[PDB]
Amino acid sequence: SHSLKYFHTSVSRPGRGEPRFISVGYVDDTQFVRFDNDAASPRMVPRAPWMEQEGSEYWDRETRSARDTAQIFRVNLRTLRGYYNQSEAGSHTLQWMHGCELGPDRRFLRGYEQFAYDGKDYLTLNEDLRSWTAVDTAAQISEQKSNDASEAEHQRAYLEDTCVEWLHKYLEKGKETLLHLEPPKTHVTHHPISDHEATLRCWALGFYPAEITLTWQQDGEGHTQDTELVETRPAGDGTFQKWAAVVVPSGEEQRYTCHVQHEGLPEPVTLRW
Amino acid sequence: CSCQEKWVGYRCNCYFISSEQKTWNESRHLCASQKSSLLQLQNTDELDFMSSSQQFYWIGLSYSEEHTAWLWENGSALSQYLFPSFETFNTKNCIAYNPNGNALDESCEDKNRYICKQQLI
Amino acid sequence: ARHCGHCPEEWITYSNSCYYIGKERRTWEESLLACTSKNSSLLSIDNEEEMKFLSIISPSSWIGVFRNSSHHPWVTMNGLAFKHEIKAELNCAVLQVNRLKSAQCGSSIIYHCKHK
């Protein structure tokens, strides 16, 4: 599986003029390019070292969209405030998210796209990528404004064709690192609580495909009583961490065993302590 | 009625839609050197053919301190119901139109696509 | 309220040739009919420089380029072998943001008409 997910965020500032507009493009689980009109560079910039040798031709053509996207979004942040009859001195957020996915065959698997006004989904491009759907009972306008002026067709274009193509153009450029499956460095840490109870925490360290699934199971079938789990967290260099914990009767901890289900590993590894 | 080559012709007007991104200041001069003015609007239907368009275009409209108000290239009145937020635009900043009706008051030293306009004999 | 005498009223003039701008959702078949009911043809692409223009006017449109079956060469109205790059059961082409694409001839898209 591979994805070229982009993420757009616009925040209206009454006291300034222009609203804050931020973009980030994601190959699988690497942010490689960003955009910010607040920096000393109101152009599209690279994050991932494997975009560094890309020339002007490309950047100008992507800044062209970013900049334009902010202007179109400025207007929505005003158009939307009308629909909702909202006070003009309020801060508001309009977010746009779109993504294309490849599969086993390595060609288009599925697509998606949706908008959202202040934490509440606003619009959403249907599974069939041909007609827009109104989420909020006040979105119907923006639905029928877009359904009528054939915009879905242009997204059906980007998703099934443009997005698809560039994923493949990006992966060939970051081949040696994006496709480099990293196995998690697994160990168990012991921590006591009192004399009758203690916590066994199963560690996962530095794995590049982000999707993982840690489990606690006792000598066989495996119960999930008094278990604990955390949000898969980013390293800071472009790997991932996650730990899984459980409250265990002090003395006989071997009764409980840990399993790691990861994409990069050949074997779902067993852990004992 | 007839136009120039890279120019588009509607209702005996020659329009020049822009390829490039330039200054408000610069664009005015650039229309002038091709013997046209920076786009002064009549109404919503004067750019109807460009309905869909998603770019934003510089227009021949500023705020000077003769009239403490927004006036065009010629110096005519701004139709106070063409642009709805006419009492919101930052005087320091310039306007930028888009054939969906919407306007954006914006930094004049900034770089945008733009329209020039010709007319009769 | 006077327009150009070489073209109809609500029409635009680019390069010696008039255009009709769509704003209507119709099918390739009908799109070809409607244009021919207006004494003109369906939108044909001449140069890769008309193409940039035509996207800043109105971005989606049926073009006078079609296949017969899935596997035949792409042909203009003239019956001539079409000489521009054009990208299973799709047989009529469309213009979309400065590239030519293959589309379901039953899709309800926007049509533009073209003259001489």
């Binding site: 757009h8 969209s65 996207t69 939307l80 908008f115 404004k145 915009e151 997005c163 | 919407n102 | 943001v97």
Partner: peptide, 9 residues
């Protein structure tokens, strides 16, 4: 590359 075109809500 990002989508060449958005929606006017």
């Amino acid at each position: 590359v990002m989508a060449p075109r958005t929606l006017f809500l």
